[model samples]
Target chain A: EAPFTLKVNTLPLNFDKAEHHRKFQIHINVSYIGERPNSNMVIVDVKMVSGFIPVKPSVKKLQDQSNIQRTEVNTNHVLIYIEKLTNQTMGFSFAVEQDIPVKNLKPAPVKVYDYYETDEFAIEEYSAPF
Target chain B: EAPFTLKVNTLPLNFDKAEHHRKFQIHINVSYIGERPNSNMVIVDVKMVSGFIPVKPSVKKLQDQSNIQRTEVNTNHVLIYIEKLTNQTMGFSFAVEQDIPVKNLKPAPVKVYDYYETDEFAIEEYSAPFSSDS
Candidate 1:
């Protein structure tokens, strides 16, 4: 059935980003356990870290920051807008079933990161432990 | 086949003991995974701070801080000793199957925390989003 998503993840919050604060984000969620006349299909996949995951994004401002799909059906959750995330991006967010078939995707494997200087967070690495 | 434990815990390691902080720990791991003699059955449970769970520990130095079980059948690891964990103590350590039968334990309910002050350990709460000012 390829459609069952009620995920909310902003997990890993110790806020460490300084190279003029580069961005890293993934908030792709879908919640509509199917009940006719109340439709919902939301898609927001954004990935750009230069090692070529591009099937067709040859810089048109990096294809306006990758795929943002929305087949307009809202059980309320839609914010697929990431117009600018500079300082060499790294990304993640592979949304779900608007027609399912990206060779069967499974919502993991999305990387977008650039917040260097020994990025430490996990309560500052649990106060003292490696 | 009621035995499964590779329990490693010293979690909530922000180490708080302002009333003279000295020590606290629990690292019991019984790994034998079924062979004949390559055995390991370790156990060490220590508790104090007005509450107890290392079982039968009375009071004369507070039973020297509760339970410490080690059925001695080893192949490699074990260390469970905790003493002086002030500021209202809370405890846990139910290492597995030295012939387990404490209402059928299932590992991952062990906690000993004093690391607070908005106690967040998930990458500092992922940057920020609890803004308030209205």
Candidate 2:
């Protein structure tokens, strides 16, 4: 039984370059719109594409922090879980890099899912150029 | 001689698709940041790369509009000019299409130039995915 309203935003995202690799940063915020709080956990899956490699990852939930789960890093992707998905905005940010030219980089969407409710939605895609 | 301080923003930008072509739109705002108004006229040239084509266009200077000039539209490029650049924001927007899969769509940065001042800056790039693509 799932009856939760929420919205996710990833607009304030940009990418730059490091010494010998290209670096990128993204900001994700999710706000609840439902009347009551849903104590269920929300799962967010992030994966990089176009020859991008994850490095020194950092994901945090702003405002009166909640329980956060950081999964094992696989090479290009990571899993994050948040407790008590609410009506307030929670932020997630990280950095990535690759030895290739920055121009050769392209990232896929960051997928969001309400695992406990068996409902999946929301994806933050690559929209801007660095 | 060039003497005008300008700030440009391409944040309100996104992309989509049509029947057989992917569509995109960008809103550019250039504001004057220098003391006194500049009547030397401002030139803005836009060139699109990444297999994008210029379609119908609309560029306007909101709030007491000024004289506008539209240059010949090339295949993937266009030119615009605003007379008596003042201390305000001039908005520019347009639609572009490419006959390719949205996944294969990787638009390059939109090159902007200030020909009168020999200053070329600002390039709008792809930033988000389509609703249906999500």
Candidate 3:
């Protein structure tokens, strides 16, 4: 089951692709296993467009991004639903980017990095490429 | 002392969105949990940006899109970073336009939602927002 595909993606997913920059960041993840792996809560919905082919420094996009699998208000208030069973291999991350107020760019030093435990960036060891 | 500059974002964030149909879908979140929201387990490198905007989108927009918190390799292979604090109000949600290709759209049509429980939506209710020391 679960068969759907039409993910286009033009290219250059802005890392710092200047559009005057604001502030938008995200990092949602879900990982499940089977096929000789593991599983329990299985909240699998890691869709960064379900396909890939947009290259070169330019992935800083916003306002059209999406993911947050739990938030409901009812009585006509809020109802966020994007955590599509994050268990089997779901890891949704986002960013439009901001945080430039060192009195608004004092030295031009902007750094953001979080390289979680490395089998060499192991999200299940991906196979052969290191 | 977390002031509220209107966290308003009513919700229905598509796994896809569009105006001329570009197909949108996203997933990204970070945590830090301290000033001691949780101390490090602490990858702490996460970002959810700042200032909120718009409420209940009326139409489609594949005309815009965003996020890849750690997709760097740099030959520059890739240098993506927004993992502000994987311990922390650090949870993002987004979606737009479409993803109906069972056989070219038209089915039970629609239904998608998830709620964490016991009251927590606009922030500061479910507990554990940030923490770090590693």
Candidate 4:
């Protein structure tokens, strides 16, 4: 297939909060379900909404894969560029701390988008904290 | 086909303006691309984040079909249950006002999920009102 069929198996998901620190962790995973590979790039676009600050990132790939990715942060979104994918799973995660206390926080939203074969699928944007 | 192949042609989308108030409108659309006749039950799950408030909703089906859906709001998410689908299009729109003023708001988030079979797709979330405004 010239273009790949991208499917989102997991989420740009946030987890239980450390109620005391007003911080939390966010993660998302994706897989490639396409024919023979002819490209060497996977990009993850993370919308930089409020509620948390992203620490240094940690990205993981399947054992069969050998390439890693890099990140670029803009005023609005964080861009993750992966070298390539080989029918394996990829995970991206990081930590965020709330500037203010979580108990008295306003509603916040975060978004992520996956691009393959000239198409983009936006991942679910959820409210943070429990 | 027994079940339809539901496609999200558009998003649970947001827009601009009305900054003095803390409310905005959200909209989404879907299409049916399957077989001749089958079952019916399309549902939209909207996560109630912080910031805005959802007023009464307005739903529209293709001019051909004549059935409307209902909404159920809970603590975390709002549920929109659609009755049936023909080989046409559907549109949903509503207004949400911000609880606080545009200037004194925090980082709030919202979510929406579409289900067909066992799959769900999420739409994009921008920071809102441009960071310059905040």
Candidate 5:
């Protein structure tokens, strides 16, 4: 099992109805137990799947204050780089406003891995009520 | 016209769809262009209408530092007592989670007025997407 866990928190939004069009917020956090990883850095990548869109994304130190090395926000995805993962947990949040109601809304997939080794990683996706 | 303008910022949520249930945030801000009012204090009252409920509500100073004298959060409404309204603008925000989709969802009504004088006040309600005929 991996030494750390990646968690995402957010409320469900209706993608089927046009009148229900509203912006929603997504929050991501990290938790770890036992000894620290041999690698000092980690990379997180989030991609919007189908019916969702990305707006504003931000990175913050949730627990002990970790240093964010790099962050990238593209048209439909966000990438973040962090240093000193052993020292503290980090949090990430983003807002979404628009979506395509014709397509099925899917959960955004999130991938986290050690900077040194790609195999040392975890993958998770946001859960949707629909 | 009133001495100040009250603004509410938020996104629309579905009250008819069940799977669409989600928590959303509401932001309220005040903008004043003229001289400060004769009254030194102001009162802000927000009441959630049908299909909506209240969760966590907080008060903060957005533009300039203002003092918050008192704050109350009820089951369906929030009351804030603000001091030094003449000094700076203040901001208020709250989060809502659960709702009763059976009943028609309505915009939350916000009332603002001078602490000393009740006549000098402004009333605003959130706009709903539903048609007037419905």
Candidate 6:
């Protein structure tokens, strides 16, 4: 059984509109589905499959909202180290703003795993058609 | 003093010629510069700064020639793990073939360091130009 549930959300984008290609935000939410005692640190690795470039400041702001221990931003990926995950009904939300959209935009693949126990993890490749 | 010396080499390429742009090889050489007893395993991280895409099979072949422990290949970078280094005069050599050339090509930055001692390292950014020469 999976110990966590992953969800990714983004507003609908138009492929032909120039204005829509400028910038947009992707929101990721993770919920702990395991026992309360099993709740622990989780590492979220996001690999961008498209050409969209992440805004560094926006990503930093998202990191500030949680108990994040470390963060790494690269040209095609971003890694977040969450110190701990609480069993909150609302779950934890992380958002990254990107710009310069391609003709067909694809969702970034998100991998979540226990910081100590790598076996307990969940992966999501949710796509939002433009 | 640096514990390692880094070097990158490649044949001269012509920007105007389509054949030269198709395929070319980039060579990386690393040498131990520290004390003989301090020589240990080192990690060579190569980050491609241009559009040249690495050929996986060629990279794999290079990895087989050394005491390499592990390697990771990505779209724009490659990480190589060397298990040990001997004080040889010629040093160690690694090569990766790349394709699809872009105008104004830039050399990839090569970083070599002691696996356990991160502070002892060297970096090199070498470039070769293309003109009328073949």
Index of the highest-lDDT prediction: 6
**TM-scores of all predicted structures:** 0.18, 0.39, 0.17, 0.35, 0.40, 0.43
lDDT of 5 by residue, B10-85 (tens): 6545534537565456677864434554455777787875445665433332213345677677777777776756
Q: Give the winner by lDDT: 4 or 6.
A: 6
C-alpha positional error of residue B68 in candidate 2 after TM-score superposition, expressed in Å = 52
What is the number of backbone collisions in each predicted candidate, taken in the order shown? 17, 6, 78, 14, 0, 0
lDDT, residue B49, model 1: 20
Candidate 4 residue B86 C-alpha distance from true site, Å: 64
lDDT of 4 by residue, B31-132 (tens): 445553523566655554355456644322222234445676665455666676555656665555445323223433333333454343334332333233
| iRMSD, per candidate, in listed order | 22.3, 11.8, 18.8, 11.2, 12.2, 15.3
The lDDT of each candidate is 0.25, 0.50, 0.24, 0.45, 0.60, 0.63
Candidate 6 structure quality by residue, lDDT tens digits, B2-91: 677676876534333544333445667777868765467788888764445566776676567657777789777888888876554334
Give the Cα-based TM-score of candidate 2 against the true structure.
Answer: 0.39
What lDDT tens digits, residue by residue, belong to model 1 across residues B1-134?
41223344432222233232222233433232332332222223222221112222221222244533222212222234333222222344332211111111122232222122112111100100111121
Q: Model 4 compared with the native: what TM-score?
A: 0.35
User: How far is B30's C-alpha from truth in model 3 (Å)?
Assistant: 46
Candidate 2 lDDT tens digits, B72-111: 4666566666565565666656555543222223444444
On a 0 to 100 scale, what is the lDDT of residue B114 in model 3? Answer: 12
Estimate, for each residue in A6-85, the C-alpha lDDT of model 2 and write its tens digit: 33333322222112334456555664444456546776677765555555534332222445654445656766777756
**lDDT, model 6, position A104:** 38
- Model 6 TM-score (2 dp): 0.43
Residue-level error in angstroms, candidate 3, position B72: 41
Q: A1-130, model 1: which lDDT tens digit per residue?
A: 3222333343322224221111223343433233233232223334322111222222122335443332222222222433222223234332221110011112333212112311211110100000
Give the per-residue lDDT of model 6 (tens digit) for A1-130. 7888887666443433432333445666776778666567788888764645666776676566657777788877888787776555333443343332233344568898887888888898854333
- Lowest lDDT block of 10, candidate 4 chain A: A10-19
Model 2: CA > 4 A from native: A1-20, A34-36, A57-65, A102-107, B1-134
Evaluated on the second chain alone, the candidates' TM-scores are: 0.23, 0.59, 0.22, 0.54, 0.69, 0.75
- The alpha-carbon RMSD values of the candidates against the true structure, listed in the order shown, are 20.2, 15.1, 25.3, 17.5, 18.5, 18.8
Give me the runs in candidate 3 sitting further than 4 Å from their true place: A1-19, A22-27, A32-87, A99-130, B1-134
